[PDB]
């Protein structure tokens, strides 16, 4: 190899992580909020510089390598839970929150951030503003939201949509107060999910691109796909939605340039 070449999409706007973490209001756990992030540069250093009381645990990728990865989309799910239920926000976990409110898939490949919010979400006289679902007919599928309240008939006698014995209201309140322990105090939780598809990789990250060099052996990097070889002006047929081509040996052999929308063959040098 002779040269190192980096090719990333030309996007300038930065991602709005300050609007997710520093939002005045957070949602409940049975009606958790979801935001879509795309077409922006994602610098994750602002999430490391936070004080060492932000619990940060990420699955399927290391936190250090996040700045050299492109993504199709990012999803941010925000809510507030109790102190000791942060254990349940993890793949392959069960409990009252996980079964009935928020479920994570086993192949999650995403990060979870939690922090104590007792100074904001608690009130001296009682803060019943945050709810959670306690009764459900069956466990819910990953990333499914149930914003609906109807009576739960545990027994056998039906009831006229009114509570009573063996007819329960599904939702309950948290009732946070400042005079509790550490496990009974509100916690603000943000879950980041990285959606990676066969797409033009909108959410790139901080990286400057270089000029394209052909007919020479170089180190190349297209949207995080990095390797060593020679780049030839291909004459293959890609559909407008297709981004790269795979060979019989289950490894990429052709790729589209993210700045000028042309096709290139990759060959060993």
């Amino acid at each position, epitope marked *: 190899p002779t040269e190192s070449i980096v090719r990333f999409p030309n996007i300038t706007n930065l991602c709005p992580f*300050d*609007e997710v973490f520093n939002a005045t*209001r957070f949602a409940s756990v049975y009606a958790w909020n979801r935001k879509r992030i795309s077409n922006c540069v994602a610098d994750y250093s602002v999430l490391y510089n936070l004080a060492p009381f932000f619990t940060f645990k990420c699955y399927g990728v290391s936190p250090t390598k996040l700045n050299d990865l492109c993504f199709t989309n990012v999803y941010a799910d925000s809510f507030v839970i109790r102190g000791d239920e942060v254990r349940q926000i993890a793949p392959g976990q069960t409990g009252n929150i996980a079964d009935y409110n928020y479920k994570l898939p086993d192949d999650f490949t995403g990060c979870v951030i939690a922090w104590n919010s007792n100074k904001l979400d608690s009130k001296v006289s009682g803060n019943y503003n945050y709810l959670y679902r306690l009764f459900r007919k069956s466990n819910l599928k990953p990333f499914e939201r149930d914003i609906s309240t109807e009576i739960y008939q545990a027994g056998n006698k039906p009831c006229n949509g009114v509570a009573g014995f063996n007819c329960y209201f599904p939702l309950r309140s948290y009732s946070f107060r400042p005079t509790y322990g550490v496990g009974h105090q509100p916690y603000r939780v943000v879950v980041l999910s990285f959606e990676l598809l066969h797409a033009p990789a909108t959410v790139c990250g901080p990286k400057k691109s270089t000029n394209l060099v052909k007919n020479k052996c170089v180190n190349f990097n297209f949207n995080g796909l990095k390797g060593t070889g020679v780049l030839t002006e291909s004459n293959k047929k890609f559909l407008p939605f297709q981004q790269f081509g795979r060979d019989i040996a289950d490894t990429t052999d052709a790729v589209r340039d993210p700045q000028t929308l042309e096709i290139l063959d990759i060959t060993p040098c």
Partner: antibody
Amino acid sequence: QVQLVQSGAEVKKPGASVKVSCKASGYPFTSYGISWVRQAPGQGLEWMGWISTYNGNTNYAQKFQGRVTMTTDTSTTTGYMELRRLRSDDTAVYYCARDYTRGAWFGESLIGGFDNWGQGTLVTVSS
Amino acid sequence: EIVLTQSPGTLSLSPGERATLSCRASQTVSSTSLAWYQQKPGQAPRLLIYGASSRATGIPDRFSGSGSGTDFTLTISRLEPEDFAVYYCQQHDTSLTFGGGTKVEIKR
């Protein structure tokens, strides 16, 4: 350092219209909104409105609901404000501020305030 | 909408005492949605406190904020010659409105 520069003073007449400009420098333009406030000589502050620099969404005060309109230009990173049908009560000083009270992308409330102010533009309305 | 009242209208102190300013809210205002500003004669305002407790960037430690619910307080532990100005409280819990203002001068 974050910087905001406003235009010069105006000697507008009643029944006219006025444009006030505010050029930003030293930060990513589209990550923050822009707020407009004013102070009449001898009185206190008075919020006029907010505009998002990402999608152009605005939010005005009901006192200026039908009279004011704000715009942005991302190329030069400059905000503009029209006020129409100037009365004798519109003689004041107008301040452009960088906003941290409402999000630029999603439009929700944040924890902060007007954390960077301009020099102020004096508008005098008299026949 | 929410109306904020600043009390009192004028504080007459000496360069070195302790000052306490009070902002009173009509309705209930969340503590995450209140801020304080200082304005010197002939200058533009500037942010001092946000979130009713947090301190803005580059603000000397002698400024502190506190309060909740319907009553908020800004305290200056020791008064310097440069701390004589006008102070404003702002809420953005329901719309956005400002306070009346409170001037702090020298008592001699």
